Design an enzyme around this catalytic site. Structure first.
Site, PDB file in Angstrom:
ATOM      1  N   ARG A 197       1.284  -1.491   0.221  1.00 32.56           N
ATOM      2  CA  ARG A 197      -0.325  -0.099  -0.328  1.00 32.56           C
ATOM      3  C   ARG A 197       0.886   1.502   0.241  1.00 32.56           C
ATOM      4  NH1 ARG A 197      -1.782   3.243   4.231  1.00 32.56           N
ATOM      5  NH2 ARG A 197      -0.846   1.815   5.849  1.00 32.56           N
ATOM      6  N   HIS A 216       4.759   1.583  -0.732  1.00 31.58           N
ATOM      7  CA  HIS A 216       5.813   1.584  -1.792  1.00 31.58           C
ATOM      8  C   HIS A 216       5.931   1.266  -3.241  1.00 31.58           C
ATOM      9  CE1 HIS A 216       7.753   3.297   1.587  1.00 31.58           C
ATOM     10  NE2 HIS A 216       7.189   2.168   2.476  1.00 31.58           N
ATOM     11  N   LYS A 236       1.431  12.164   6.381  1.00 33.01           N
ATOM     12  CA  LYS A 236       2.472  11.530   6.204  1.00 33.01           C
ATOM     13  C   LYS A 236       3.351  12.280   5.218  1.00 33.01           C
ATOM     14  CE  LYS A 236       4.921   7.015   5.632  1.00 33.01           C
ATOM     15  NZ  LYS A 236       5.448   6.245   4.121  1.00 33.01           N
ATOM     16  N   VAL A 262       7.237  11.873   3.947  1.00 34.92           N
ATOM     17  CA  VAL A 262       8.238  10.875   3.171  1.00 34.92           C
ATOM     18  C   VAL A 262       7.994  10.260   2.994  1.00 34.92           C
ATOM     19  CG1 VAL A 262      10.232  12.902   4.409  1.00 34.92           C
ATOM     20  CG2 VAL A 262      10.330  10.545   4.240  1.00 34.92           C
ATOM     21  N   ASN A 263       7.644   9.864   1.410  1.00 36.32           N
ATOM     22  CA  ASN A 263       6.731   8.735   0.959  1.00 36.32           C
ATOM     23  C   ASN A 263       7.737   7.936   0.011  1.00 36.32           C
ATOM     24  OD1 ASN A 263       5.461   5.849   2.101  1.00 36.32           O
ATOM     25  ND2 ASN A 263       4.754   6.689  -0.021  1.00 36.32           N
ATOM     26  N   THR A 264       8.579   6.982  -0.784  1.00 35.68           N
ATOM     27  CA  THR A 264       8.424   6.134  -1.669  1.00 35.68           C
ATOM     28  C   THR A 264       7.737   5.462  -2.006  1.00 35.68           C
ATOM     29  OG1 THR A 264      11.294   6.816  -1.202  1.00 35.68           O
ATOM     30  CG2 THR A 264      11.548   6.090  -2.791  1.00 35.68           C
ATOM     31  N   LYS A 270      18.688   1.261   8.732  1.00 34.36           N
ATOM     32  CA  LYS A 270      19.393   2.152   9.388  1.00 34.36           C
ATOM     33  C   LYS A 270      19.240   2.804  11.079  1.00 34.36           C
ATOM     34  CE  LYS A 270      18.135   5.577   6.135  1.00 34.36           C
ATOM     35  NZ  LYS A 270      17.035   6.712   5.156  1.00 34.36           N
ATOM     36  N   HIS A 306       9.498  -3.022   5.159  1.00 35.44           N
ATOM     37  CA  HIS A 306       9.922  -1.987   5.306  1.00 35.44           C
ATOM     38  C   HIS A 306      10.843  -0.689   4.313  1.00 35.44           C
ATOM     39  CE1 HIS A 306      11.032   1.748   7.862  1.00 35.44           C
ATOM     40  NE2 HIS A 306      12.331   1.899   7.801  1.00 35.44           N
ATOM     41  N   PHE A 307      10.494   0.646   4.103  1.00 38.05           N
ATOM     42  CA  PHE A 307      11.211   1.242   2.806  1.00 38.05           C
ATOM     43  C   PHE A 307      12.623   1.721   3.677  1.00 38.05           C
ATOM     44  CE2 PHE A 307      11.688   2.085  -1.762  1.00 38.05           C
ATOM     45  CZ  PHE A 307      12.671   3.539  -1.416  1.00 38.05           C
ATOM     46  N   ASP A 308      13.439   0.861   3.518  1.00 33.77           N
ATOM     47  CA  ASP A 308      15.089   2.162   3.944  1.00 33.77           C
ATOM     48  C   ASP A 308      15.403   3.370   3.395  1.00 33.77           C
ATOM     49  OD1 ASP A 308      16.287   0.956   7.275  1.00 33.77           O
ATOM     50  OD2 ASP A 308      17.778   1.513   5.539  1.00 33.77           O
TER      51      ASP A 308
END
Ligand SMILES: [Pt+2]
Ligand SMILES: [Pt+2]
Length: 124
Positions: A10, A12, A41, A43-45, A66, A119-121
């Site tokens: 949902r 990324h 939100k 920041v989101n990629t 991270k 997770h998008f790191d």
């Protein structure tokens, strides 16, 4: 409840297109993925690749996350992403985003069976 896998898709995964159509992309996508509902939100990629190509990252270059965990993977190849970043003037409920298109390596955290992004790191 939503699985960590399903939440990653949902937030990324945008397999529709292969990149940002306009620079209203973020304002529409952040909306359509429920990322402006509670708060804006910041920041989101979005990754503009097939599920199969993003899930395969979990068999690629193993790196530190991270947060210090070592279940992160860097894609060997660059990938089509849109970075979405709230403007300085953006105020909830009228969230505004700057759309940056790019081709970069992604770093994701993977878990479960099947072993898939949760997770998008970062992008590199
Ligand atoms: Pt590279
Ligand atoms: Pt997690």
């Amino acid at each position: 409840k939503e699985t960590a896998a399903a939440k990653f898709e949902r937030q990324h995964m945008d397999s529709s297109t292969s990149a940002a159509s306009s620079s209203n992309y973020c304002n529409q996508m952040m909306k359509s993925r429920n990322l402006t509902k509670d708060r804006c939100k910041p920041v989101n990629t979005f990754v503009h690749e097939s599920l199969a190509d993003v899930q395969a990252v979990c068999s690629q270059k193993n790196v530190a996350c991270k947060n210090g965990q070592t279940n992160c993977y860097q894609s060997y190849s660059t990938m089509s992403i849109t970075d979405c970043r709230e403007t300085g003037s953006s105020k909830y409920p009228n969230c505004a985003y700057k759309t940056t298109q790019a081709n970069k390596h992604i770093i994701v955290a993977c878990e479960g069976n099947p072993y898939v992004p949760v997770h998008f790191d970062a992008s590199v």
